[PDB]
Amino acid sequence: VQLVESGGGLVQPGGSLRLSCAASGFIFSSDWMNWVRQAPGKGLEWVANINQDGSEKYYVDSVKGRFTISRDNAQNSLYLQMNSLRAEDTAVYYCAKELGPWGQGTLVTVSSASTKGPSVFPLAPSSKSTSGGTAALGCLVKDYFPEPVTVSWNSGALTSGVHTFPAVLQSSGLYSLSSVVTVPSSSLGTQTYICNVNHKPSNTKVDKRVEPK
Amino acid sequence: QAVVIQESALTTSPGGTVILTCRSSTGTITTSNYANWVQKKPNHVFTGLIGATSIRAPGVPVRFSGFLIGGKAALTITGAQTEDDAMYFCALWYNTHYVFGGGTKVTVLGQPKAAPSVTLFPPSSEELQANKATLVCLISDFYPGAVTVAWKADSSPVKAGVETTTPSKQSNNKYAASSYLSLTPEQWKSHRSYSCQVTHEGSTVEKTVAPT
Ligand SMILES: [Cl-]
Ligand SMILES: [Cl-]
């Protein structure tokens, strides 16, 4: 079973967004479907639900008159039309049923601030700064808005020793994260290490090669 | 408006029996509230374990059970496993809407204490050309998930420009965090070195970088 979500993004106050939840691997028309949201640091908030045929729909009072839940059983899709978006609607939105895994969640940001692409700086290692023969190199993804950012290494082929850290929220409102990969010193002069940063909200894809100083 | 009340936190041993309760602030819970138990793990989507008070989701281990007792909805774990260490949310249907509880953090004992590993990166050559300078201190593989960070300009403390993340759980059930010190390019070269000190369970780990 799978529930894939899409449609979240950055939108100015008063704007609109339409979320979609693609269902597969189960009899979609047999289940009620729910939209649930959670803002960072806050609790889970049920938003809306809908019955099998779509004749019954319920909403939380904070949402009545602005959101509209709908479904298409012929296409196994659940929708959430979101109008008159407010800053308080900023949250990760999840589609879910009573049983089984929720969707992966899509992020909705209602803010008057514009998106900003990150700066990527290499975190070069040092042979004199090792620990038991292992080195440590990485990339610094600084000053972007909003979440998320994906970082891979050597176009996804390098995964052993990779550690990407959750971003920090700076006082200015911008985010910064780092991704680190630990590798032996013998591979410092034989292997090539390149981090692939992707910030989809700003359409910024940057590649940075990391080599010792 | 009705609220859903859960225990904040519970601790058990492997093979122990846990019982989580879920009550309504308005009074008795019945099967008409269609209690739903949702499990949340770090880096794993929410998943509904129990629906309609007592229906186990497919694939959910049979050691999880839901039922009603004393006017409250309950979820037991008979013979808890380390993989059950997670957050458990309760949701109750009040005629026209679902309301989620605050969630119960269930801790399964057994994880040994682990000291933090600290890696400190000086400002790169690229960033210094942009008249910026940031120190990146990376803390990983510590348990329990709580560390304090203090920075040092030479040998004296420095609080301005420090931003540290909350601890986050890693794939190996240990925790990680990062700390960023923002400095001008001039301050970075006017000092002999900078240090990032990480204190965990009474022991402190330190890392030092110097202008090159
Ligand atoms: Cl834990
Ligand atoms: Cl460099």
Side-chain angles (χ1 to χ4, degrees), chain A residues 1-113 115-213, chain B residues 2-158 160-212:
Chain A
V1 293
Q2 278 226 251
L3 291 174
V4 187
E5 325 186 13
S6 61
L10 171 61
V11 147
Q12 305 188 31
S16 297
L17 280 179
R18 181 188 181 91
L19 305 183
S20 52
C21 178
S24 51
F26 67 101
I27 305 180
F28 175 72
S29 64
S30 71
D31 297 316
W32 291 69
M33 293 301 295
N34 301 263
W35 284 107
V36 180
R37 71 187 177 181
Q38 174 182 42
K42 282 73 173 298
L44 281 168
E45 192 181 22
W46 178 90
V47 178
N49 70 340
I50 190 173
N51 70 334
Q52 298 82 342
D53 51 38
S55 65
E56 293 187 335
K57 349 194 181 188
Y58 304 92
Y59 303 89
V60 61
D61 290 336
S62 320
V63 144
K64 281 193 171 193
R66 303 189 296 111
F67 295 0
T68 297
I69 184 173
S70 62
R71 72 152 75 208
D72 194 333
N73 289 325
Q75 289 185 339
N76 303 317
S77 301
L78 179 71
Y79 306 100
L80 178 64
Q81 180 62 39
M82 299 163 68
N83 299 335
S84 305
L85 282 174
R86 305 164 174 172
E88 306 85 46
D89 297 317
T90 299
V92 179
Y93 284 72
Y94 307 94
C95 57
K97 37 196 178 68
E98 189 79 352
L99 303 176
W102 297 12
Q104 79 286 354
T106 186
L107 190 267
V108 175
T109 300
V110 189
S111 177
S112 57
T115 182
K116 182 167 191 175
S119 298
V120 184
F121 304 101
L123 300 180
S126 185
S127 67
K128 286 288 184 181
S129 176
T130 58
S131 184
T134 59
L137 61 101
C139 280
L140 169 60
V141 184
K142 184 175 181 54
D143 293 336
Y144 62 88
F145 178 83
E147 293 277 42
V149 159
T150 58
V151 179
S152 65
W153 283 95
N154 297 349
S155 305
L158 173 57
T159 54
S160 182
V162 175
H163 189 353
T164 296
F165 289 75
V168 62
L169 183 51
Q170 312 174 183
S171 55
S172 61
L174 301 176
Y175 292 93
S176 296
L177 56 74
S178 301
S179 174
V180 198
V181 41
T182 58
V183 278
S185 299
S186 64
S187 58
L188 189 92
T190 38
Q191 311 287 341
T192 293
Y193 299 87
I194 300 181
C195 75
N196 311 100
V197 184
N198 187 13
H199 182 244
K200 284 195 178 74
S202 63
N203 251 89
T204 301
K205 299 200 295 182
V206 178
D207 288 326
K208 278 300 194 218
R209 181 159 184 265
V210 184
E211 42 184 24
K213 297 171 65 68
Chain B
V3 302
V4 177
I5 302 165
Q6 301 188 246
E7 300 99 335
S8 60
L10 291 176
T11 68
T12 185
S13 299
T17 295
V18 193
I19 174 172
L20 298 80
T21 63
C22 176
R23 59 240 295 165
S24 170
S25 67
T26 52
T28 306
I29 292 173
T30 65
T31 53
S32 312
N33 298 117
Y34 301 99
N36 185 213
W37 293 90
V38 179
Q39 178 187 71
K40 170 61 182 172
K41 299 175 185 178
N43 311 278
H44 289 275
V45 309
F46 296 85
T47 178
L49 299 191
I50 307 295
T53 303
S54 55
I55 303 305
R56 261 191 292 268
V60 169
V62 305
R63 60 172 182 278
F64 293 90
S65 301
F67 54 99
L68 297 182
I69 178 65
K72 330 161 197 174
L75 173 76
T76 55
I77 311 173
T78 301
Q81 300 296 301
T82 54
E83 77 167 345
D84 303 337
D85 191 308
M87 205 88 178
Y88 296 83
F89 290 87
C90 178
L92 301 181
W93 177 260
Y94 292 97
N95 275 274
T96 63
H97 59 278
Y98 268 114
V99 174
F100 273 100
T104 305
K105 187 173 175 180
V106 173
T107 298
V108 177
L109 301 182
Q111 179 85 354
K113 295 189 173 183
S117 170
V118 181
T119 299
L120 184 60
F121 284 104
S124 56
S125 305
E126 229 289 76
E127 188 182 9
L128 293 175
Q129 174 61 29
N131 202 45
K132 303 294 179 67
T134 51
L135 307 178
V136 181
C137 194
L138 307 150
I139 320 166
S140 54
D141 291 326
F142 56 92
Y143 184 88
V147 292
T148 54
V149 180
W151 291 82
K152 243 75 176 181
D154 303 344
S155 193
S156 54
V158 46
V162 176
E163 286 174 341
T164 310
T165 71
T166 61
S168 69
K169 182 163 170 173
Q170 304 175 175
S171 60
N172 57 9
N173 299 330
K174 293 166 183 174
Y175 288 77
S178 53
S179 186
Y180 293 86
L181 177 54
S182 293
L183 298 165
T184 69
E186 276 63 275
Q187 288 175 346
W188 164 244
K189 294 184 181 179
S190 61
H191 288 88
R192 44 165 285 186
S193 72
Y194 280 88
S195 295
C196 170
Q197 302 182 14
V198 183
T199 300
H200 177 273
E201 209 70 76
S203 303
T204 309
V205 188
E206 69 292 328
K207 232 50 179 165
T208 304
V209 294
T212 297

